[PDB]
Chain A
Amino acid sequence: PRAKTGIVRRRRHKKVLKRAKGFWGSRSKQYRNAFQTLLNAATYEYRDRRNKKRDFRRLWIQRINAGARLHGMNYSTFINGLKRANIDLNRKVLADIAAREPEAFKALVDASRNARQ
Chain B
Amino acid sequence: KTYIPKNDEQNWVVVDASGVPLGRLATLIASRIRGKHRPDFTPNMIQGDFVVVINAAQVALTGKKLDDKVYTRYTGYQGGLKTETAREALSKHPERVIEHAVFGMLPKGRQGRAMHTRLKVYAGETHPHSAQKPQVLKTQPL
Contact = CB atoms under 8 A, between A and B. Distances in A.
Interface in A72-103: 72, 93, 96-97, 99-100
Contacts of A59: 2, 40, 43
Contacts of A70: 37-38
Nearest to B43: A59
A97 B2 CA distance: 8
A106 interface: no
B36 A66 contact: yes
B77 interface: no
Contact of B37 (A66, A93, A96, A99): A66
Interface size range of chain B in the complex: 10 to 19
B142 interface: yes
B122 to A, nearest CB: 27
A56 interface: yes
Contact of A93 (B2, B40, B41, B142): B2
B39 interface: yes
A69 B37 contact: yes
A56 B43 CA distance: 11
8 contacts: A59-B40, A59-B43, A62-B40, A66-B37, A66-B38, A67-B39, A69-B37, A96-B39
Interface of A: 56, 59, 62-63, 66-67, 69-70, 72, 93, 96-97, 99-100
Given A63-B39, A63-B41, A96-B39, 6 more contacts: A59-B40, A62-B40, A66-B37, A67-B39, A69-B37, A100-B3
